[PDB]
Amino acid sequence: MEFLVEDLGLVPYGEAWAYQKRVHREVVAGNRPPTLLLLEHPRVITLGRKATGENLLFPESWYRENGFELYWVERGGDVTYHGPGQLVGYPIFPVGREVRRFLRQIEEAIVRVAAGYGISAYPTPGYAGVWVGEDKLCAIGVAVKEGVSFHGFALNVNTDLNDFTVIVPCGLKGKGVTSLEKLLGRKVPMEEAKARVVAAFAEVFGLRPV
Template sequence: MTQQINDTVISKTLLSKTLIAADYNPTHDAMLARTLERIALKKDQNLRSPDELWIVDHNDVYTLGQAGKEEHVLQHTDTPIIKTDRGGQVTWHGHGQLVIYWLFDLHSLGWSVRHLVSHAEQAIEDVVNECLNSQSSSNDPDTNNGSKISAHARRDAPGVYLYADASEKASVTAEDNELNLPSDDAIMLGKIASLGFKIKHGFSYHGIALNINCDLSAFNAINPCGYAGMQMLRLSGFVAIQENTNEALSYEQVTQKLIDNIAQRHAGLIELRPVAPKR
């Protein structure tokens, strides 16, 4: 049964809601109902309601996007497969993965859909890179093999990916730094975060999923986001994620970092970096 922890006022125009052990269908139904209610308030009464971030810990589920192809489900397990109305193909949600739904009025923010996607990817990049840079050691000392690990978005495949660069003098240009591009010598290790949105009358819902300390074996039954052989990663494979300690990051700390980053973007305090061209 879904348990709602709290509603938090972040600002006059942004609220957050926390749900744990959340079943997918009732969560989706509530998110859609709230979006339709906000659309009606704006259309009928010209009222701007506060935007919302839903911080969700889902019970295990596979979701298939609106144009999702069944062929990307490689194996049927006891985990339910639910057709939904977001963009994208098939993915998994479950415990240890941070899901944040963005219920935003894009027109009031002055954002295009491209702005929304770029803000989502860049928020994840910022937080994951901060976490990676905050700890020099990995849970598994052999994981990084002395390489610098960094998070980057890709124009050809939505989401955020980790790259390893072992070169002492990586060939990164000033433009690459501004765009947060990996160096020419970097090797892509896999995908750490996914995103998929739905836009209705200028309002967004659905959102992002960041693998923090989840069991990645659930992805073995699918082609994640429609990419055969895509290696899925989690943050705990590269930095220590623990509970009740001052010496390591916790799931809650990573969550709060991401909420804070998104809230600053929502308030116009963090501007978009230029979007990288397709390579």
């Protein structure tokens, strides 16, 4: 009937990943409620299940020389970028076998957040993530182990969208990327975006936030 929200603020990817895994273990064990981690990462590129070297425009070494961290991970999707101004959410929830349903719920929550800003967003029939017209507002890529989810979503709030140009996702997609800031012509407070995300998750999942 409840979910726990933890706002970790700005956390390096590697230690945040270790934290995800510890949170996941507790939820698997039934010793922690379904938990939504909300956070930001310093500039980082992650390469998921479907990722290869073609997803990086420059050599790997270029990225580390130019202020990115880079990691290979086991979430769905190929390459993505996280950085300051992007609200990263890791719902570590006991989803069981119904992963597609879970993805649709994350999508729905994000669509609600966008609607709250007067923005019409949609999952799209054909592209992973949540889109506003031809531009991706929120990336989504999860993993599930022992019936509990990890990884999650990355909502562009005040993201430096220019940082996406150096990665080259593959497969079906729209044309670009967007953020609440770009759509609204001004920065949106991160604290507010977090609150709206929490409210949307509470509504979609039918759970009370603690």
